[PDB]
Design a protein around this ligand. Structure first.
Ligand SMILES: [Zn+2]
Length: 145
């Protein structure tokens, strides 16, 4: 959804959180907010995966013209790859929803630091503060290659 604020908040019927003066970070009202966002996002992804699978099955049923056989296969692979990515995202959201249920949502998993509210509104599935997240990515390239 073409919105300045991630189509994610759009995906959910959510409006950017109006943080009050002295509110503690992840209080009941705040996590209820992010729980809703995560759930809405997850449900949307699930519907996309279903539509994809259905399209893929329609493709398996309808035979293309010799000319469009390479084009169908190309698009089919894209659907497949994409589909599998969404399933991963959905599992991540589910994991995040348990952090909410467990009241352990909103902080960096490496260092105890709180992850931004606006940052969580961008990727509510965030596991690391930007620093630890980045450092991890760097270690990756080095411990790997
Ligand atoms: Zn950290």
């Amino acid at each position: 959804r073409k919105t300045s604020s991630l189509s994610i908040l759009a995906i959910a019927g959510v409006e950017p959180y109006q943080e009050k003066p002295g509110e503690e970070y992840m209080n009941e009202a705040q996590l209820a907010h992010f729980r809703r966002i995560l759930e809405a996002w997850r449900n949307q992804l699930r519907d996309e995966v279903d539509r994809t699978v259905t399209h893929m099955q329609d493709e398996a049923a309808n035979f293309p013209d010799p000319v469009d056989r390479a084009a169908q296969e190309e698009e089919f692979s894209l659907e497949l790859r994409n589909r599998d990515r969404e399933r991963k995202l959905i599992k991540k959201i589910e994991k995040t929803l348990k952090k909410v249920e467990d009241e352990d949502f909103g902080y960096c998993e490496s260092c105890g630091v709180e992850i931004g509210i606006r940052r969580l509104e961008a990727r509510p599935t965030a596991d690391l503060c930007i620093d630890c997240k980045t450092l991890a990515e760097i270690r990756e390239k080095q411990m790997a290659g």
